[PDB]
């Protein structure tokens, strides 16, 4: 019992880092040459994509802070998603019949 919980909990991390980063970068990018967000309603959306290795492009980070969030959210989003990919593998093995 771990592949399940570990995966289920992983989702929480990505969720947290998502909001945090968004607001973290916003406060910065807000006052500096950055993407077209200058707010959470827009930034939050950027974090979500960045977390899912998406990164549309319509709004990308530039400033140190803004960029720092992208990397922070990326590792968090991937980590949470990874546990899920491996979680299924563990359970997939426990089903010979």
């Amino acid at each position: 019992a771990l592949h399940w919980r570990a995966a289920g909990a992983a989702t929480v991390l990505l969720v947290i880092v998502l909001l945090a980063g968004s607001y973290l970068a916003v406060l910065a990018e807000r006052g500096a040459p950055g993407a077209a967000l200058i707010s959470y309603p827009d930034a939050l959306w950027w974090s979500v994509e960045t977390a899912t290795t998406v990164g549309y492009g319509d709004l990308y980070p530039v400033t140190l802070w803004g960029r720092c969030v992208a990397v922070v959210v990326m590792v968090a989003g991937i980590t949470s998603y990874g546990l899920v990919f491996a979680a299924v593998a563990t359970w997939f093995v426990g089903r010979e019949q």
Binding site: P33, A36, G57, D58, V62
Partner: protein, 37 residues
């Protein structure tokens, strides 16, 4: 900045930004090329 700029290539998208105001480097959107810093 985001104005009504045609969208065909990136190499040209820059020349347009610099000409319009004074910027470069900008992705191309299905609608219109967006200018960035």
């Amino acid at each position: 900045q985001f104005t009504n700029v045609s969208c065909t290539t990136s190499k040209e998208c820059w020349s347009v930004c610099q000409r319009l105001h004074n910027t470069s480097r900008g992705k191309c959107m299905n609608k219109k090329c967006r200018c960035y810093s």
